[PDB]
Design an enzyme around this catalytic site. Structure first.
Site, PDB file in Angstrom:
ATOM      1  N   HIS A 178       2.935   0.860  11.430  1.00 27.66           N
ATOM      2  CA  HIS A 178       2.874   1.575  12.738  1.00 27.66           C
ATOM      3  C   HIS A 178       2.295   0.640  13.788  1.00 27.66           C
ATOM      4  O   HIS A 178       1.116   0.352  13.727  1.00 27.66           O
ATOM      5  CB  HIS A 178       1.946   2.784  12.584  1.00 27.66           C
ATOM      6  CG  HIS A 178       2.565   3.895  11.802  1.00 27.66           C
ATOM      7  ND1 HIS A 178       1.870   4.998  11.327  1.00 27.66           N
ATOM      8  CD2 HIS A 178       3.859   4.093  11.472  1.00 27.66           C
ATOM      9  CE1 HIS A 178       2.718   5.801  10.709  1.00 27.66           C
ATOM     10  NE2 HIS A 178       3.923   5.286  10.786  1.00 27.66           N
ATOM     11  N   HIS A 186       0.244   2.849   6.233  1.00 27.34           N
ATOM     12  CA  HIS A 186      -0.020   3.953   5.269  1.00 27.34           C
ATOM     13  C   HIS A 186       0.710   3.479   3.998  1.00 27.34           C
ATOM     14  O   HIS A 186       1.777   2.877   4.088  1.00 27.34           O
ATOM     15  CB  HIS A 186       0.539   5.264   5.795  1.00 27.34           C
ATOM     16  CG  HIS A 186       0.116   5.582   7.203  1.00 27.34           C
ATOM     17  ND1 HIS A 186      -0.896   6.472   7.476  1.00 27.34           N
ATOM     18  CD2 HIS A 186       0.503   5.062   8.400  1.00 27.34           C
ATOM     19  CE1 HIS A 186      -1.091   6.517   8.786  1.00 27.34           C
ATOM     20  NE2 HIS A 186      -0.266   5.657   9.369  1.00 27.34           N
ATOM     21  N   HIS A 246      -9.905   5.339   6.964  1.00 25.90           N
ATOM     22  CA  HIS A 246      -8.612   6.008   6.749  1.00 25.90           C
ATOM     23  C   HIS A 246      -7.456   4.996   6.577  1.00 25.90           C
ATOM     24  O   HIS A 246      -6.550   5.218   5.799  1.00 25.90           O
ATOM     25  CB  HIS A 246      -8.308   6.925   7.940  1.00 25.90           C
ATOM     26  CG  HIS A 246      -9.343   7.985   8.163  1.00 25.90           C
ATOM     27  ND1 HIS A 246     -10.216   7.962   9.230  1.00 25.90           N
ATOM     28  CD2 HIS A 246      -9.658   9.083   7.441  1.00 25.90           C
ATOM     29  CE1 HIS A 246     -11.015   9.010   9.169  1.00 25.90           C
ATOM     30  NE2 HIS A 246     -10.687   9.713   8.099  1.00 25.90           N
ATOM     31  N   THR A 276       0.180  10.999  13.347  1.00 23.43           N
ATOM     32  CA  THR A 276       0.213  11.515  11.950  1.00 23.43           C
ATOM     33  C   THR A 276      -1.188  11.696  11.303  1.00 23.43           C
ATOM     34  O   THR A 276      -1.282  12.021  10.130  1.00 23.43           O
ATOM     35  CB  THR A 276       1.057  10.619  11.019  1.00 23.43           C
ATOM     36  OG1 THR A 276       0.377   9.368  10.849  1.00 23.43           O
ATOM     37  CG2 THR A 276       2.422  10.377  11.593  1.00 23.43           C
ATOM     38  N   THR A 277      -2.253  11.470  12.060  1.00 21.96           N
ATOM     39  CA  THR A 277      -3.603  11.732  11.625  1.00 21.96           C
ATOM     40  C   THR A 277      -4.246  12.577  12.694  1.00 21.96           C
ATOM     41  O   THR A 277      -3.796  12.577  13.829  1.00 21.96           O
ATOM     42  CB  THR A 277      -4.469  10.443  11.503  1.00 21.96           C
ATOM     43  OG1 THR A 277      -4.509   9.782  12.759  1.00 21.96           O
ATOM     44  CG2 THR A 277      -3.923   9.511  10.441  1.00 21.96           C
ATOM     45  N   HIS A 308      -1.372  -0.667  12.041  1.00 19.47           N
ATOM     46  CA  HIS A 308      -1.931  -0.301  10.734  1.00 19.47           C
ATOM     47  C   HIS A 308      -0.816   0.118   9.806  1.00 19.47           C
ATOM     48  O   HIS A 308       0.319   0.200  10.230  1.00 19.47           O
ATOM     49  CB  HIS A 308      -2.915   0.858  10.920  1.00 19.47           C
ATOM     50  CG  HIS A 308      -2.271   2.099  11.463  1.00 19.47           C
ATOM     51  ND1 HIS A 308      -2.157   2.354  12.818  1.00 19.47           N
ATOM     52  CD2 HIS A 308      -1.683   3.142  10.831  1.00 19.47           C
ATOM     53  CE1 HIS A 308      -1.502   3.497  12.986  1.00 19.47           C
ATOM     54  NE2 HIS A 308      -1.217   3.994  11.799  1.00 19.47           N
ATOM     55  N   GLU A 354       5.236   7.581   5.425  1.00 22.14           N
ATOM     56  CA  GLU A 354       5.046   8.856   6.087  1.00 22.14           C
ATOM     57  C   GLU A 354       6.425   9.474   6.365  1.00 22.14           C
ATOM     58  O   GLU A 354       6.755  10.562   5.881  1.00 22.14           O
ATOM     59  CB  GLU A 354       4.177   8.665   7.336  1.00 22.14           C
ATOM     60  CG  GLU A 354       2.790   8.138   6.979  1.00 22.14           C
ATOM     61  CD  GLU A 354       1.691   8.647   7.879  1.00 22.14           C
ATOM     62  OE1 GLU A 354       1.798   8.358   9.056  1.00 22.14           O
ATOM     63  OE2 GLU A 354       0.745   9.336   7.436  1.00 22.14           O
TER      64      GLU A 354
HETATM   65 ZN   LIG Z   1       0.007   5.518  11.324  1.00 25.23          ZN
END
Ligand SMILES: [Zn+2]
Ligand SMILES: [Zn+2]
EC number: 4.2.1.1
Lengths: 259, 259
Positions: free
Chosen positions: A118, A95, A63, A197-198, A93, A105
């Site tokens: 993040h 996005h 992911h 957020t996941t 990590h 995000e």
């Molecule tokens: Zn994140």
């Protein structure tokens, strides 16, 4: 048996099927409307103590990719700001998008960035991460926008190892990484109570989202897009657009540390 | 490595260490004080539909033994009573003592029974048990006291297979068990909102506790006490006193279906 992703059929629009909290009252990310996100003068300065940060490994989880830290001691902590007590850094990590115009995000007056970093911390009050994730004040995620511009020197060490974790499940040793090299100069922030957020989308996160983006080069972010969601041997599926869109704010207040 | 049990060092008095909800506001079991547990005339009759129940296997999990049911359809459901919608039977198990004078989890005016049966059902609203356990209205456990008296014919099929699941991890095929054979004649009940009585102690359970106990023989309950907590080859540790004691009621109301 259970899977989730960012695709047509397993994407954010479908996460509620297995994770009903997806429709909850404290979901992230959100849009930060600067006209409504009021300066709160009682918000304290954010204290980032990363001088002793000890990175261990980097890994493609299918992911995103995570850099993991030794959280067995107070070597890299977030304190102050909107937070009560001490939060240890466990991992970071990103996005990102398939194009430079999208990837973040959180948005700011509907503006999307190319990516979002993040840094994930847990409240030491709860003994470990596992217990932390289940508490309302369990996590603090420091969120940082990435815009395409000048190369970020402090990001190059990440970029350089990415060819060794192309596919899901791959990992590599990753020592001495300096997370201070990913911070902007200003620690001015917005804050609000939210969620992962996941999946599993747990509503355990005090969000701290920095005003100032960091710049990364066109070629740096392009390297993130050559990763794969899929495992080795599976059909190629490029790891792009691994961001959840803005969720309704409901009756939450986004507070600002700055005017 | 996480473990829990009913021993000196890993017992109910210590569960809070790994499971902080142990000190929560809706923990089970409780004492039912009949002087304070008021008759509620708006409580509906309990509807037990077990005519099509399909048992599959019996297994020693190292804490009790469970009879597992096919919950892929509405073959064995609990409805009405204090419940909203339809709850499928997934398994039953018991808690029992090392002596006839103790063993139950719930008590009644401080009175302990020799054992307690727990028929575990999940709200079909949530698709499976895994999603159910995380919701406030996820589960309904029908609790039934066991007193030592006359043999319970409908329990003998359970008792007869126990020599084949002595130790943790052991299981055996267990088809065509009739769970109606474990019910008393009155379905008069007490009800209150509570929790799993074992870790992870989740506060997802509507408790339905029947007024009328069933009788079992001294030799029937004695067979439960020849089971082992331990795995094969490990030190013998007889599976007795696998009950959590009464927890504080806090601001909960125990309602009675009968006067
Ligand atoms: Zn994140
Ligand atoms: Zn039980």
């Amino acid at each position: 048996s259970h899977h989730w992703g960012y695709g047509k059929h397993n994407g954010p629009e479908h996460w509620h099927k297995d994770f009903p909290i997806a429709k909850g009252e404290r979901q992230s990310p959100v849009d930060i409307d600067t006209h409504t996100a009021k300066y709160d003068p009682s918000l304290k300065p954010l204290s980032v103590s990363y001088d002793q940060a000890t990175s261990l490994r980097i890994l493609n989880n299918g992911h995103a990719f995570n850099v993991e830290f030794d959280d067995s001691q107070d070597k890299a902590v977030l304190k102050g700001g909107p937070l009560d007590g001490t939060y240890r850094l466990i991992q970071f990590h990103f996005h990102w998008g398939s194009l430079d115009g999208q990837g973040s995000e959180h948005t700011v007056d509907k503006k999307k960035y190319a990516a979002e970093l993040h840094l994930v911390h847990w409240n030491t009050k709860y003994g470990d991460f596992g217990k932390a994730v289940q508490q309302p004040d369990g996590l603090a995620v420091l969120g940082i926008f990435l815009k395409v511009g000048s190369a970020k020197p402090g990001l190059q060490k990440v970029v350089d190892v990415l060819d060794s974790i192309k596919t899901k499940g791959k990992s590599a040793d990753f020592t001495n990484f300096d997370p201070r090299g990913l911070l902007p100069e200003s620690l001015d922030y917005w804050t609000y109570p939210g969620s992962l957020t996941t999946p599993p989308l747990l509503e355990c996160v005090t969000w701290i989202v920095l005003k100032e983006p960091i710049s990364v080069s066109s070629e740096q972010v392009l390297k993130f897009r050559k990763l794969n969601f899929n495992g080795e041997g599976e059909p190629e599926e490029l790891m792009v657009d691994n961001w959840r869109p803005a969720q309704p704010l409901k009756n939450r207040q986004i507070k600002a540390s700055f005017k």
